[PDB]
Amino acid sequence: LDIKKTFSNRSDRVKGIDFHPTEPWVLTTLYSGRVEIWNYETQVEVRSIQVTETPVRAGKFIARKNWIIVGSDDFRIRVFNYNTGEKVVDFEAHPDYIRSIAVHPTKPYVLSGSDDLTVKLWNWENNWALEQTFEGHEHFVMCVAFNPKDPSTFASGCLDRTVKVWSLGQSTPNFTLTTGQERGVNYVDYYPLPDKPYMITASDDLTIKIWDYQTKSCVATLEGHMSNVSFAVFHPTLPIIISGSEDGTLKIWNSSTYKVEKTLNVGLERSWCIATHPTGRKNYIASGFDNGFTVLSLG
């Protein structure tokens, strides 16, 4: 782990973060209602937008459309062209907070997960129409993720202590995984490679759990965080897991042995959100915190 501090910035709390797949940019979504796009190589802001006066809780690039899509605590999804700043659409997505946004890799679909207990699917080639509401969870939906190996399916992690895996076009989940994470699931992420049908969940109960979604077994429990675990993800190109917590740390874990490799306190207080460069450029990761964000090259 030959970690380089590529770029960091002090700001209001960073609730969402995302890498652009080809330009040297990260998107951050802030508690102040602003979003920022930063060039982490030149360390210069590309663009920023005052989206709203409420927190912007989730944001993603849609690179093939030159857009960012963001969701905020005023209950709205907004889409902007990141080259001009033009607002492409603005609509009320849910009657409560938007926790998570996922963008389908090949079809014009976005998912939003909400405190309204649902996931909603919006189709940008049908004028951002709502096309499906996935119902069945019994608490706030904290995180949505397409299966990269089969994006006709996706997982939702919920404070009801479950992950539900759904098929587009089907109203009942394919299955529900009961995590035993009694304080709920804050995050879910899929392992990207074909050799293991695995996913990972993070919880306020201080645990991270790896799951085989075919057998439903808990493969491993990663213990060590001392407060709520905000996220845990598999790195796209290195055999590691990255987690972050309200304990203020990031942890890097070996994804073969499930042992901790390094714990970092980057000095920005609580950690809230994570992104990884999608093709492993410089093995970059980025995390948003109470006091700003950092971009690290892991080696």
Write a brief caption for the model:
The strands form 7 sheets. A 4-stranded antiparallel β-sheet has the order 1-28-27-26, with no helix packed on it. Strands 2-3-4-5 form a 4-stranded antiparallel β-sheet, with no helix packed on it. With 299 residues, the chain is mainly beta.
Q: Can you describe what's shown?
A:
This protein is an all-beta fold and 299 residues long. It has one domain: YVTN repeat-like/Quinoprotein amine dehydrogenase (Methylamine Dehydrogenase, Chain H), CATH 2.130.10. It has strands at 4-10, 14-19, 25-30, 34-39, 44-50, 56-62, 67-72, 76-81, 87-92, 98-103, 109-114, 119-123, 129-134, 141-147, 150-158, 162-167, 175-178, 187-190, 198-202, 207-212, 218-223, 229-234, 240-245, 250-254, 260-264, 271-276, 284-289, 292-297. The strands form 7 sheets. A 4-stranded antiparallel beta sheet has the order 1-28-27-26, with no helix packed on it. A 4-stranded antiparallel beta sheet has the order 2-3-4-5, with no helix packed on it. A hairpin with a 4-residue loop joins strand 19 (198-202) and strand 20 (207-212). This is Coatomer subunit beta'.
The number of helices is: 0
Beta strand %: over 45%
Element order: H for helix, E for strand:
EEEEEEEEEEEEEEEEEEEEEEEEEEEE
Biggest sheet: strand arrangement: 1-28-27-26
Helix content: under 10%
CATH topology: Methylamine Dehydrogenase, Chain H
CATH architecture assignment: 7 Propeller
Count of beta strands:
28
The figure for the number of domains is: 1
Q: Please tell me what the overall shape is.
A: globular
The level 1 CATH classification is Mainly Beta
Alpha-carbon distance between the two ends: 6 Å
- What is the gyration radius calculated from CA atoms? 18 Å
How would you name the CATH homologous superfamily?
YVTN repeat-like/Quinoprotein amine dehydrogenase
Biggest beta sheet summary: 4 strands, antiparallel
Structure class: mainly beta
